[PDB]
Amino acid sequence: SAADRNVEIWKIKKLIKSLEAARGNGTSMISLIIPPKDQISRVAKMLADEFGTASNIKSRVNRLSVLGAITSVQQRLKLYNKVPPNGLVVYCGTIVTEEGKEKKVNIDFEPFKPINTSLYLCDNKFHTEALTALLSDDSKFGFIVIDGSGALFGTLQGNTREVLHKFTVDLPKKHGRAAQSALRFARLRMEKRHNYVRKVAETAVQLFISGDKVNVAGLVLAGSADFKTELSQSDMFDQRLQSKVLKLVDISYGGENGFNQAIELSTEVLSNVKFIQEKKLIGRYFDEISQDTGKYCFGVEDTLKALEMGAVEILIVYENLDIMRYVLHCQGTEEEKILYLTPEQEKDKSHFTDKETGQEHELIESMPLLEWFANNYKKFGATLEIVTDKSQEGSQFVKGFGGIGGILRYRVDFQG
Amino acid sequence: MPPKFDPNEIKVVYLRCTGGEVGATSALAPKIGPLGLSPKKVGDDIAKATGDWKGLRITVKLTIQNRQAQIEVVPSASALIIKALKEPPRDRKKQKNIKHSGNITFDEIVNIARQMRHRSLARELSGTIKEILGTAQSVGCNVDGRHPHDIIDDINSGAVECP
Amino acid sequence: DRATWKSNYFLKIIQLLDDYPKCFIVGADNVGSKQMQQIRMSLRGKAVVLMGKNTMMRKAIRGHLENNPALEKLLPHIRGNVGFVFTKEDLTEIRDMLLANKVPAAARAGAIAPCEVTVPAQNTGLGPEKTSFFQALGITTKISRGTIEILSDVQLIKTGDKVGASEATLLNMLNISPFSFGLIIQQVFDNGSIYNPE
Amino acid sequence: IIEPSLRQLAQKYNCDKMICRKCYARLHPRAVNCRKKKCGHTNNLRPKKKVK
RNA sequence: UGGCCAUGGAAGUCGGAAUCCGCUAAGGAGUGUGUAACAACUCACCUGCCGAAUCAACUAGCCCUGAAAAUGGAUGGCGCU
């Protein structure tokens, strides 16, 4: 289900927030990630020698901490017997927190996406750079490696490299050694060679499409032998699929070994793509400003007022705002309100006296905005679009307009 | 209010519908709200306080703006008052399956419903109004375990009491 | 249906003839359902309004029914868009109540003009809009700071004159509604005797 | 720009028609059947699309 | 009568379970068009002119549409209504 997946992402994001905060005085913390294919024994051994080494650590508080963590991460791994699919992510240590409370913790879990990123570390802190880099890069891209020998269809995350389906074929010989039959055999060879392409072009629809919509934001075709092109520019390959043909890549090698080659030759394009789509969206946002229209908005005050009401269509936000939603509160009267304060206005501000009554209006702690949108953009109007300051249209959005706004579902006049 | 910014008296009325609670998606103010001095969040909180504890299963909201003070009232819609006199109160979030139990009797309670009708209907008194509201019930299914349709034709009550 | 309904209406009109010996024949004319709802509300208690056709051509059968003559006199006046008003109060009072009720209803383009229609000197209630629509025929209109003001009291359409299309649309934009009427009285029936709005 | 009665005069003659689904024949708006023999009096008609 | 569900908005009008009463002369909890949503427009029952017959769904006979190939061309030919 989609809702259960969104809960598991929120769970993991919250886990990361805590682990980045954690910290512990003295001590170290086992960052650890065991990729899908790995043998867990291999990990147990590694740990066991990492243990034996750590027993010569000169510092006590560090030593005994590290030994403890390694003792306990081994015990976690004992509860699994094969590596869970989609990898494993363990995070031992002895985190410190408020109240002077030294507490041990051992968070292991199969992460929801497969991942292809091993890591081991002892250091003062935990390392969750891998994990954030697997929530950021959703963008699944489809690969199809055509060759005279055979095909390979496969999907692709940031790091993760899946193999969907494949086959090979006995295509005919190049030549027909009779004078007349030469011509017929040629025409016949052309028919079976094309038929193979027809099969590939159907299979790709069968694999990379789902509910009359392609599941992959690109569709890299690869290979050699002027074949990938024969697919690329045919009437057989479905136009919604062929719309997202993103590259024809000439690879040496074929099949599985062909795959990796096809990805490394593709790397540059799949980066550009994410920026291209961003440029396109904001480009439209600006079109509504360029023409009078009315169906745009900008600056929290206006934008959220548009959201609250007959909502926006698309809401565009620069992926980090500073800007933060605070929940202000009164001591005596119990009257309360909420405000969207800038980095300067949030840090120190004499504004927040109650004035009418005459008391110090205390600001109960914040929830940072971009995250606030991410929580509850669905309870409004939808399509929360994170953007960047890399493109010229991107920067103009971030710099000028404030990296916040949205394309509206109809024309609205604003006042004050 | 015509030329620039002048409240001569301002007893301006406009008819919003819906309002169990606040509503994030709201659509309460804009357009009509701000021009005319009525705000947005305060007007929403006042709208919540009026249509708080019953009705919480949809209402109506005529908003009489006394310059800056909005007067929210709950004018009755037949279907809304029938849903108010149902089997309360499982308000929101399960809920879910769904809001259509509809076996809650109301025999003499509907007499109150036809009485509170703002005259309306161009009726020949309650005898016909009974039929009207006695059908308006999409959910309720009339008395104990009855149908609406033709039991209505043999009414033997409240002809002279409702005026 | 439509045999049982036809016979059921026969039973309505015959009952309304038995109940009331006094009726009032009114033309429906260019009339709304809203107008008919208003006239039902005002004349609710005393009178009963009805709207028939050529099953009104059936007053013959009531006269046949071992009793009435005099209803023979009423058959020729059930022509045009006719609707009855059955009642028991009085005649000249009800005539005045019918005349007093009425409704505005905006200009009909093409039809005759009953009274001398005028255009008083006043603003339209608009911004810098088309003054050419007003000035096309022969009206003095200026743009005195935004609003299109008419600068003189002028008579556009006289009695028994055909109302043009462009002048009708301008009157509709100004919210000037002298044309139409509501409903007219053609003939009367009072306990056997007939009267003609006198 | 263009006078509204006159427009509707000129609309009558150009825009307010029925079009045969077979042979794209332009037909008077009252039409139930095509003229054209090539389509065999189709009856699949439709109203000419309007300019927005 | 912003009817119920659906709020992303469906007050007849993306959809779906409903689908009754009043006034009724008569208008569907609504054919469409159009709306962010309304509004506005549009589509029964009855009249006036009018004045006796008129309409629907099937079916089958001939004819037509469906019906495109290469030397010029073949109901045998001319021709035939």
Swiss-Prot record, chain A:
Q: Which Pfam families match?
A: eRF1_1 (PF03463), eRF1_2 (PF03464), eRF1_3 (PF03465)
Q: What is its main location?
A: cytoplasm
Gene Ontology biological-process annotations? cytoplasmic translational termination; nuclear-transcribed mRNA catabolic process, nonsense-mediated decay; protein methylation; regulation of translational termination; translational termination
| Compartments, record wording | Cytoplasm
Gene3D superfamilies attached to this UniProt entry: 3.30.1330.30, eRF1 domain 1, eRF1 domain 2
SUPFAM superfamilies cross-referenced by the UniProt entry:
L30e-like, N-terminal domain of eukaryotic peptide chain release factor subunit 1, ERF1, Translational machinery components
Chain residue numbers at which the record places covalent cross-link Glycyl lysine isopeptide (Lys-Gly) (interchain with G-Cter in SUMO2): 82, 399
Q: Which UniProt keywords apply?
A: Acetylation, Cytoplasm, Hydroxylation, Isopeptide bond, Methylation, Nonsense-mediated mRNA decay, Phosphoprotein, Protein biosynthesis, Ubl conjugation
Q: Which domain of life is it from?
A: Eukaryota
A Gene Ontology cellular component where this protein is annotated is: cytoplasm
UniProt motif NIKS motif: location: 56-59
Which residue positions does Phosphothreonine occur at?
A: 342
Q: Which residues carry this modification: 4-hydroxylysine?
A: 58
Instruction: Cross-link Glycyl lysine isopeptide (Lys-Gly) (interchain with G-Cter in ubiquitin): give the residues.
Output: 274
Which GO molecular function, any one, fits this protein according to its record?
A: translation release factor activity, codon specific
Please list the residues that carry the modification N5-methylglutamine: 180
Can you summarize the PTM annotation of this record? Methylated at Gln-180 by N6AMT1.
Subunit and interaction comment = Component of the eRF1-eRF3-GTP ternary complex, composed of ETF1/ERF1 and eRF3 (GSPT1/ERF3A or GSPT2/ERF3B) and GTP. Component of the transient SURF (SMG1-UPF1-eRF1-eRF3) complex. Interacts with JMJD4. The ETF1-GSPT1 complex interacts with JMJD4.
What family classification does the UniProt entry report for this protein? Belongs to the eukaryotic release factor 1 family.
* Biological function: Component of the eRF1-eRF3-GTP ternary complex, a ternary complex that mediates translation termination in response to the termination codons. The eRF1-eRF3-GTP complex binds to a stop codon in the ribosomal A-site. ETF1/ERF1 is responsible for stop codon recognition and inducing hydrolysis of peptidyl-tRNA. Following GTP hydrolysis, eRF3 (GSPT1/ERF3A or GSPT2/ERF3B) dissociates, permitting ETF1/eRF1 to accommodate fully in the A-site and mediate hydrolysis of peptidyl-tRNA.
**Which protein are we looking at?**
Eukaryotic peptide chain release factor subunit 1
- Native source organism of the sequence: Homo sapiens
**Which gene is this protein's source?**
ETF1
Swiss-Prot record, chain B:
UniProt PTM: Ubiquitinated at Lys-48 and Lys-83 by RNF14 and RNF25 in response to ribosome collisions (ribosome stalling).
State the Gene Ontology BP annotations. Answer: translation
The protein's matches in InterPro entries, at most eight in alphabetical order, are given as: Ribosomal_uL11 (IPR000911), Ribosomal_uL11_C (IPR020783), Ribosomal_uL11_C_sf (IPR036769), Ribosomal_uL11_CS (IPR020785), Ribosomal_uL11_N (IPR020784), Ribosomal_uL11_N_sf (IPR036796)
Q: Where in the cell is it found?
A: Cytoplasm
Which of the residues bear the PTM N6-acetyllysine?
A: 54
Major localization class: cytoplasm
Q: Which terms in the GO cellular component ontology are assigned?
A: cytosolic large ribosomal subunit
- Transmembrane spans: none
SUPFAM superfamilies xrefs: Ribosomal L11/L12e N-terminal domain, Ribosomal protein L11, C-terminal domain
Crosslink feature (Glycyl lysine isopeptide (Lys-Gly) (interchain with G-Cter in ubiquitin)) location: 48, 83
Q: Which UniProt keywords apply?
A: Acetylation, Cytoplasm, Isopeptide bond, Phosphoprotein, Ribonucleoprotein, Ribosomal protein, RNA-binding, Ubl conjugation
Q: Name one GO molecular function term.
A: structural constituent of ribosome
Q: Position(s) of the covalent cross-link Glycyl lysine isopeptide (Lys-Gly) (interchain with G-Cter in SUMO2)?
A: 40
Q: What does this protein do?
A: Component of the large ribosomal subunit. The ribosome is a large ribonucleoprotein complex responsible for the synthesis of proteins in the cell. Binds directly to 26S ribosomal RNA.
Name recorded for this polypeptide: Large ribosomal subunit protein uL11
| Organism of derivation | Oryctolagus cuniculus (Rabbit)
What taxonomic lineage is listed for the species of origin? Eukaryota, Metazoa, Chordata, Craniata, Vertebrata
Q: Tell me the gene name.
A: RPL12
